[PDB]
Write a protein that binds this ligand. Sequence first.
Ligand SMILES: Nc1cnc2c(c1)COCC2
Ligand SMILES: Nc1cnc2c(c1)COCC2
Length: 330
Amino acid sequence: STGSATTTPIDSLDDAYITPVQIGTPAQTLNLDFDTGSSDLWVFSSETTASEVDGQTIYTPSKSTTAKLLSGATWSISYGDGSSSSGDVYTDTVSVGGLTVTGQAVESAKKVSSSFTEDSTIDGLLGLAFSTLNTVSPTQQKTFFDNAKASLDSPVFTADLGYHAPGTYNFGFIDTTAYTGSITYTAVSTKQGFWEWTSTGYAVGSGTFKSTSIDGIADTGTTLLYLPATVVSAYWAQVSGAKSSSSVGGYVFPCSATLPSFTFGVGSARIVIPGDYIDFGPISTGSSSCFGGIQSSAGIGINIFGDVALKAAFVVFNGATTPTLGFASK
Ligand SMILES: Nc1cnc2c(c1)COCC2
Ligand SMILES: Nc1cnc2c(c1)COCC2
């Protein structure tokens, strides 16, 4: 089998991407944030505290003839921005782009934190990291990809995120029309439960490439590119007036600037992020200070190849017995 679904930016900045997902019988369609940095499929629901729902579409398990309470199971998760959610668990039928899994754990939110309530465009998350990170207790549950894998034509999914435009998540096949050149594959460590790999270096604009190993994660659920402070300083030094602002929480730059590109290495290959992808707009409405898309990972403990990096490539998440990652230009 295969599946193919369009993913759409939630706003004019590409802060995140939503993909429609069918849950239950009859289908209830929710728009979920596909997140290769976590491993829980959770949704706003009829159980979510009413004051914490503001415009999202909810899953109502009592209206699904295939929903079953997973007795005793609870979940609770926290993300890198300090946001969080928790609740109980149903199993139900879940379909993405024509690909169907029966018996998928659907984690129903009883509580969500303010940043989720405040974002009316995201109805939940669909985790695509390794199932060892799944938070369900006392019986850990499998991701949608892990449950689908045996039925797929090939044990892979691909992320093709757009810049200010829709893109595609495919399951079970590699669309050879969606990229240019060849796909370069690179090793993955699953030891932290992430799609963790090692970039071979970087370049700033037209500058010379610096060969240096940069361990990080491919994370569709993180907006920006978080790299070591040395790398980030070298990038922003090429932008007149750019500076790190403790009050704003990162590097800012004059909105009048034209930003240089940033290149990262994948083996001997190179992925170029155009400068415009690094512009995240005014820090507050009407300001002439703009927020940068490349930020320091120093206070995180891990480097993160988030959407800013991934949307410059066609990315293969290869879930074969030994997982690997593939990157192609497009
Ligand atoms: N830092 C961070 C990483 N991933 C996510 C969030 C924050 C919040 O939305 C869910 C996914
Ligand atoms: N994506 C994104 C993340 N953080 C910030 C902005 C955008 C805007 O400026 C303030 C801080």
